[PDB]
Amino acid sequence: GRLIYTAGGYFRQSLSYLEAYNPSDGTWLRLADLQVPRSGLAGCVVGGLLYAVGGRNNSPDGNTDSSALDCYNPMTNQWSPCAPMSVPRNRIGVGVIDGHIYAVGGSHGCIHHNSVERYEPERDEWHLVAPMLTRRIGVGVAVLNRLLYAVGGFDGTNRLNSAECYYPERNEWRMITAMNTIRSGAGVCVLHNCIYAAGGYDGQDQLNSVERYDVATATWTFVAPMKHRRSALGITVHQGRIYVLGGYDGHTFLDSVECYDPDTDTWSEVTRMTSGRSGVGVAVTMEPS
C-alpha cells in the first residue's frame, strides 16, 4: 500500500501540512506537521523514507529561504532533521540516483543557483557536484536511466525552455533538446521511460500544456493538456499514472488533483486537497503504520 504524500506548500503563508492521499479509497490522512513551515520545497523517497528538501518559510514574522533537509518515517509518523545543504534553495528541484539525493538549483534571496549537490543518506553528508550550465529557479528535475535532467526554470531574468542532462559517472552537464514551451515551476517526472513536463509559467500565462521527452528520438512531443492551468504544482507517479497537485492559476491556489492515464492520453480530476496550496513537495511511499 503506497500513498501520495504532500508536504508543505503555500497559501497566504508557508505551510506545515503533511497529508497523504490514498488513490483507492479517496481519503486524505493528516500526518505529523513539518518542523518548520515551508513552501517551494521538493519531496523524494529513498529507502522508504520521505525527504523534504529546501524551500522557504514565508511567515508573518519574516521570510527565510531554507537549506534544511528533513526526513519523515511512515513507520513512526515522526520527522527527523538531516544535515542541511550548503546553501538555501527556494523553488528547488530534486532527483534520486543510486540512493543519493541530488539538489538542483533554486534561489537564495537574489542569488539564482546553478550549483547542484548530492546527499548520501548512509553518512548524512552533502557534497557539491558540477554546477549546471544554467541558473535555474523553479527547475523541474527527473531521473531517467540513472541520468539527471534539469528542465526549464527561471534564470533571474528569463524563463527557460532549455534542458540539460547530468552524467554522475562523468560529473558533467550537457545540454539536450529544449522543450517546445517555456516553463518555470512546471511539474517534471518520469513515467515509463519518458520525461514529462506539465504546466508551469512562461512569464505571461500559467500553462496547462504537457510535453514528453523520449531519449531514443531526443525530441519533445506534446501530449494531452491538463484540465487546469497551474504553476508551482506538485507532481509524482503512482502505479503507472501521473498525479499533479495544487498550484497557482493566476488567481487561485488550487486544491485540484488531476491524474494522467498514459494508456489513454487523458487527464481527469480525481480529488480535491483539503485546502488549496502551491509549491508543495510530493512523493510516494508506504502508508504509515
Curated annotation (Swiss-Prot):
Name of the protein: Kelch-like ECH-associated protein 1
Modified-residue entries (S-cGMP-cysteine), positions: 110
Kelch repeat start-end pairs: 3-48, 49-99, 100-146, 147-193, 194-240, 241-287
Location within or outside the cell: Cytoplasm; Nucleus
Outcome (variant: residue 112 to A): Loss of interaction with NFE2L2/NRF2. Abolishes repression of NFE2L2/NRF2-dependent gene expression. Does not affect interaction with SQSTM1/p62
Site (Sensor for electrophilic agents) residue list: 110
Comment, domains: KEAP1 contains reactive cysteine residues that act as sensors for endogenously produced and exogenously encountered small molecules, which react with sulfhydryl groups and modify the cysteine sensors, leading to impair ability of the BCR(KEAP1) complex to ubiquitinate target proteins. The Kelch repeats mediate interaction with NFE2L2/NRF2, BPTF and PGAM5.
Post-translational modification: Non-enzymatic covalent modifications of reactive cysteines by electrophile metabolites inactivate the BCR(KEAP1) complex. Accumulation of fumarate promotes the formation of cysteine S-succination (S-(2-succinyl)cysteine), leading to inactivate the BCR(KEAP1) complex and promote NFE2L2/NRF2 nuclear accumulation and activation. Nitric oxide-dependent 8-Nitro-cGMP formation promotes cysteine guanylation (S-cGMP-cysteine), leading to NFE2L2/NRF2 nuclear accumulation and activation. Degraded via a proteasomal-independent process during selective autophagy: interaction with phosphorylated SQSTM1/p62 sequesters KEAP1 in inclusion bodies, leading to its degradation.
Effect of residue 40 to C: In a lung adenocarcinoma cell line; also in NSCLC cell lines; strongly reduces interaction with NFE2L2/NRF2 and reduces repression of NFE2L2/NRF2-dependent gene expression
Phenotype for residue 159 to A: Loss of interaction with NFE2L2/NRF2. Abolishes repression of NFE2L2/NRF2-dependent gene expression. Loss of interaction with PGAM5. Does not affect interaction with SQSTM1/p62
Family indicated by similarity: Belongs to the KEAP1 family.
Known outcome of mutating residue 56 to A: Loss of interaction with NFE2L2/NRF2. Abolishes repression of NFE2L2/NRF2-dependent gene expression. Impaired interaction with SQSTM1/p62
Residues where S-(2-succinyl)cysteine is found: 289
Subunit structure: Component of the BCR(KEAP1) E3 ubiquitin ligase complex, at least composed of 2 molecules of CUL3, 2 molecules of KEAP1, and RBX1. Interacts with NFE2L2/NRF2; the interaction is direct. Forms a ternary complex with NFE2L2/NRF2 and PGAM5. Interacts with (phosphorylated) SQSTM1/p62; the interaction is direct and inactivates the BCR(KEAP1) complex by sequestering it in inclusion bodies, promoting its degradation. Interacts with NFE2L1. Interacts with BPTF and PTMA. Interacts with MAP1LC3B. Interacts indirectly with ENC1. Interacts with SESN1 and SESN2. Interacts with HSP90AA1 and HSP90AB1.
Effect of residue 91 to A: Loss of interaction with NFE2L2/NRF2. Abolishes repression of NFE2L2/NRF2-dependent gene expression. Loss of interaction with PGAM5. Does not affect interaction with SQSTM1/p62
Tissue: Broadly expressed, with highest levels in skeletal muscle.
Function: Substrate-specific adapter of a BCR (BTB-CUL3-RBX1) E3 ubiquitin ligase complex that regulates the response to oxidative stress by targeting NFE2L2/NRF2 for ubiquitination. KEAP1 acts as a key sensor of oxidative and electrophilic stress: in normal conditions, the BCR(KEAP1) complex mediates ubiquitination and degradation of NFE2L2/NRF2, a transcription factor regulating expression of many cytoprotective genes.
